[PDB]
């Protein structure tokens, strides 16, 4: 009884984790966004110097 109560609590925790992770997976990645932000920042600095 005690182990199955703990098991259902851990199952609820896993379902909360999956519920947040599915919403996060509707958004694009993190590191690729950092790479394209670095590229856009370099291009914006070059365009600002040209302007």
């Amino acid at each position: 009884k005690k182990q199955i109560l703990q098991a259902k609590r851990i199952r609820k925790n896993r379902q909360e984790y999956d519920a947040l992770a599915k919403v996060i997976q509707h958004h694009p990645d993190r590191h690729e966004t950092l790479k394209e932000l670095e590229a856009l920042g370099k291009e914006l600095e070059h365009l600002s110097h040209i302007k």
């Binding site: 925790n13 909360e16 996060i24 990645d29 993190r30």
Partner: protein, 41 residues
């Protein structure tokens, strides 16, 4: 008993605002939830 990325811990603990840092969690459950919604924001 059948069920279905990450941030560095010190960077997460020192970059997030204390509303999202949740200093009362310093449980692993609320800690992982704070990591998840910090990644979302």
């Amino acid at each position: 008993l059948e069920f279905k990325d990450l941030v560095s811990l010190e960077e997460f603990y020192k970059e997030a605002p204390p509303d999202i840092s949740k200093a009362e969690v310093t449980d692993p459950h609320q800690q992982t939830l704070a990591r998840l919604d910090w990644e979302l924001e």
